[PDB]
Design a protein around this ligand. Structure first.
Ligand SMILES: COC(=O)c1c(C)n[nH]c1-c1ccno1
Ligand SMILES: CSc1nc(C)nc(N)n1
Ligand SMILES: [Mg+2]
Length: 208
């Protein structure tokens, strides 16, 4: 039972700017996602200080980077707070709608694309490198869901029949054919050390 939702107008505009603009410096996509996982780990750590039962779905707080040349994907996996179904459909768009307008208004005035994080929309930097993004995510309060979009103004949501994951977010990045460099162990190490040396959680880079 796959449901299809149109992106709010503003967001669909952002996602295009990212997909079509000439920007050579695409590696920022990673520290954004990694940063995003970190914020998500942060939220659960804190919540669990008052509710130790919130960690009954996973005590380990970590980020994994999992490259896959075969199915041409880079995945960032976190055991963060994860996203309820309302997050995916309603909430995160409402935050991101203001987030975008600010980001966009700052783009003439001469800020660049790498400052996307300060505007609350780093997630979308994933489109600098991916042709389609899939998001597996599990919140304590809701069931497990698959979100997915290849942009073009729309995105789907479905309850997921995959491996259960206790709690977290997987972000599967289905890379564009000219972006397979973000699949290489040495290349990933370089961006992690360069942009994310001071993340507060173990980032394991998997090898093949
Ligand atoms: C996991 O991907 C996301 O976080 C997401 C979705 C599914 N919609 N909007 C957003 C978002 C994140 C940050 N700003 O927006
Ligand atoms: C609320 S959970 C979340 N959110 C984001 C933007 N990212 C991640 N990894 N998790
Ligand atoms: Mg591990």
């Amino acid at each position: 039972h796959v449901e299809t939702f149109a992106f709010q107008a503003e967001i669909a505009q952002l996602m295009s700017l990212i997909i079509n603009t000439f920007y050579s410096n695409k590696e920022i996509f990673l520290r954004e996602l990694i940063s995003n996982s970190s914020d998500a780990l942060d939220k659960i750590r804190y919540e669990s200080l008052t509710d130790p039962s919130k960690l009954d779905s996973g005590k380990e707080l970590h980020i994994n980077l999992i490259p896959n040349k075969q199915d041409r994907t880079l995945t960032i996996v976190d055991t963060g707070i994860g996203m309820t179904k309302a997050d995916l459909i309603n909430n995160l768009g409402t935050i991101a709608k203001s987030g975008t307008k600010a980001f966009m208004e700052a783009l003439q005035a001469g800020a660049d694309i790498s400052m996307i994080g300060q505007f609350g929309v780093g997630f979308y930097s994933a489109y600098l490198v991916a042709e389609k993004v899939t998001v597996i995510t599990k919140h304590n309060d809701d069931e497990q869901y698959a979100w997915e979009s290849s942009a073009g103004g729309s995105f789907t949501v479905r309850t997921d029949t995959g491996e259960p994951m206790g709690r977290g977010t997987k972000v599967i990045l289905h890379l564009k054919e000219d972006q397979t460099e973000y699949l290489e162990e040495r290349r990933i190490k370089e961006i992690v050390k360069k942009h994310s040396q001071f993340i507060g959680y173990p980032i394991t880079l998997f090898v093949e």
